[PDB]
UniProtKB/Swiss-Prot annotation, chain A:
Component of the PEX1-PEX6 AAA ATPase complex, a protein dislocase complex that mediates the ATP-dependent extraction of the PEX5 receptor from peroxisomal membranes, an essential step for PEX5 recycling. Specifically recognizes PEX5 monoubiquitinated at 'Cys-6', and pulls it out of the peroxisome lumen through the PEX2-PEX10-PEX12 retrotranslocation channel. Extraction by the PEX1-PEX6 AAA ATPase complex is accompanied by unfolding of the TPR repeats and release of bound cargo from PEX5. Coiled coil: none annotated. AAA-cassette D1 is required for interaction with PEX6. ATP-binding in AAA-cassette D2 is required for interaction with PEX6. ATP-binding and hydrolysis in AAA-cassette D2 is required for proper function in PEX5 dislocation. It is found in: Cytoplasm, Cytosol; Peroxisome membrane. It comes from Saccharomyces cerevisiae (strain ATCC 204508 / S288c). The chain holds residues 613 to 715 of 1043 of the full protein. The lineage of its organism: Eukaryota, Fungi, Dikarya, Ascomycota, Saccharomycotina. Transmembrane segments: none annotated. It comes from the Eukaryota. This is Peroxisomal ATPase PEX1. Interacts with PEX6; forming the PEX1-PEX6 AAA ATPase complex, which is composed of a heterohexamer formed by a trimer of PEX1-PEX6 dimers. The PEX1-PEX6 heterooligomers associate with the peroxisomal importomer via interaction of PEX6 with the peroxisomal membrane anchor PEX15.
From Swiss-Prot, chain B:
AAA-cassette D1 is required for interaction with PEX1. ATP-binding in AAA-cassette D1 is required for attachment to PEX15. ATP-binding and hydrolysis in AAA-cassette D2 is required for release from PEX15 and proper function in PEX5 dislocation. Component of the PEX1-PEX6 AAA ATPase complex, a protein dislocase complex that mediates the ATP-dependent extraction of the PEX5 receptor from peroxisomal membranes, an essential step for PEX5 recycling. Specifically recognizes PEX5 monoubiquitinated at 'Cys-6', and pulls it out of the peroxisome lumen through the PEX2-PEX10-PEX12 retrotranslocation channel. Extraction by the PEX1-PEX6 AAA ATPase complex is accompanied by unfolding of the TPR repeats and release of bound cargo from PEX5. It comes from Saccharomyces cerevisiae (strain ATCC 204508 / S288c). This is Peroxisomal ATPase PEX6. Interacts with PEX1; forming the PEX1-PEX6 AAA ATPase complex, which is composed of a heterohexamer formed by a trimer of PEX1-PEX6 dimers. Interacts with PEX15; anchors PEX1-PEX6 heterooligomers to the peroxisomal membrane and mediates their association with the peroxisomal importomer. Interacts with UBP15.
Length: 103, 79
């Protein structure tokens, strides 16, 4: 919010509220957030003609492409992202495993 | 000092010995779409891209045009 205020005046005017993208942006340093917000701000001339960037969840388009200064080098583990819904029929084990993890 | 009319038009003749070199002046260079300037003097023409079929070129040219256009808005975009 401070960074959005420190750019030349623009506003998050739609019913989106900052916590949404905050929960969407766990792995970021302050410098990364300054950059990410500048990348959003460039919407103001790259795509919109408006003097103010009503944001319309455009973050969901750009934040998929931008990345922090973290997450460097090609390393992955969550990529498959199949969730617990895609159990391999661990009927006699998924219970105890998820319980022992979650408690 | 030969004539009071000076602005509307004048003739140089190489029999007249003067010149001036006031460093530099700054002026906008012509757009290709109107000028086509290269093809007149026959230099190694740049490839004329189209604005559609190489979409990343549209991306880059818009990214630069942002800062030509924002000059009226006065913001220095630093693109």
């Amino acid at each position: 919010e401070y960074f959005f205020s420190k750019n030349q005046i623009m506003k998050l005017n739609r019913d989106l509220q900052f916590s949404d993208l905050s929960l969407e942006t766990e792995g970021f340093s302050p410098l990364d957030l300054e950059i990410f917000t500048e990348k959003i701000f460039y919407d103001l001339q790259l795509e919109r003609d408006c003097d103010n960037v009503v944001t319309r969840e455009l973050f969901s388009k750009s934040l998929s492409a931008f990345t922090p200064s973290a997450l460097r080098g090609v390393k992955l583990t969550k990529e498959t992202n199949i969730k617990w819904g895609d159990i391999g029929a661990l009927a006699n084990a998924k219970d105890v495993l998820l319980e022992t993890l979650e408690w | 000092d030969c004539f009071s009319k000076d602005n509307s038009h004048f003739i140089i003749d190489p029999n007249r010995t003067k010149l001036i070199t006031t460093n530099i002046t700054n002026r906008r260079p012509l757009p290709l779409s109107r000028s086509n300037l290269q093809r007149y003097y026959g230099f190694a023409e740049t490839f004329y891209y189209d604005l559609h079929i190489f979409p990343y070129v549209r991306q880059l040219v818009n990214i630069l045009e942002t800062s030509f256009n924002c000059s009226q808005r006065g913001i220095t975009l630093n693109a």
